[PDB]
């Protein structure tokens, strides 16, 4: 594989959201290391959103334009995520639209999956902020 430099989403939370690991023409990899700040009760349940938001921006570096953004998403939760688990989201392109992106995304633990779900992305003309 030839490597590519982050062309996006460059000031994501290494914390909070993951760090990538892995970037190519047409898939990436980002892992993420999950903290006490993430669990919704005492016995340690990590919120589905810091989950998501890992696969979301795999999603964003999958594709890796400078405008890429989520427009849609449908998810499943397969495995409850607890704190101290490090996840590794796993995201390809399945379907180039020209300007919209269909990348299928999977969040393992291991080799266990804890969510899969189609991301559809678009590559906007500007930034989304304008």
């Given at each position: 594989m030839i490597p590519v430099e982050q062309r996006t989403h460059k000031?994501?939370?290494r914390i909070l959201v993951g760090k990538?690991?892995?970037?190519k023409e047409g898939?990436?990899?980002?892992?993420?290391?999950?903290?006490?700040?993430?669990?919704?009760?005492?016995?340690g349940l990590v919120h589905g959103g810091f989950t998501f938001g890992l696969a979301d921006y795999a999603a964003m570096l999958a594709v890796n334009e400078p405008t890429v953004v989520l427009g849609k998403?449908?998810?499943?939760?397969?495995?409850?995520?607890?704190?101290?688990?490090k996840l590794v989201a796993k995201a390809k392109i399945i379907e180039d639209l020209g300007k919209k992106k269909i990348v299928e995304v999977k969040v393992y633990r291991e080799e266990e999956v804890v969510l899969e779900g189609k991301f559809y992305?678009?590559?906007?003309e500007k930034h989304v902020l304008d």
């Amino acid at each position: 594989m030839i490597p590519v430099e982050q062309r996006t989403h460059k000031l994501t939370s290494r914390i909070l959201v993951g760090k990538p690991i892995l970037i190519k023409e047409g898939y990436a990899e980002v892992e993420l290391e999950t903290i006490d700040e993430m669990k919704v009760d005492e016995k340690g349940l990590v919120h589905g959103g810091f989950t998501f938001g890992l696969a979301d921006y795999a999603a964003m570096l999958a594709v890796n334009e400078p405008t890429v953004v989520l427009g849609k998403a449908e998810v499943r939760f397969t495995k409850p995520v607890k704190v101290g688990d490090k996840l590794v989201a796993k995201a390809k392109i399945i379907e180039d639209l020209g300007k919209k992106k269909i990348v299928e995304v999977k969040v393992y633990r291991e080799e266990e999956v804890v969510l899969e779900g189609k991301f559809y992305c678009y590559v906007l003309e500007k930034h989304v902020l304008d």
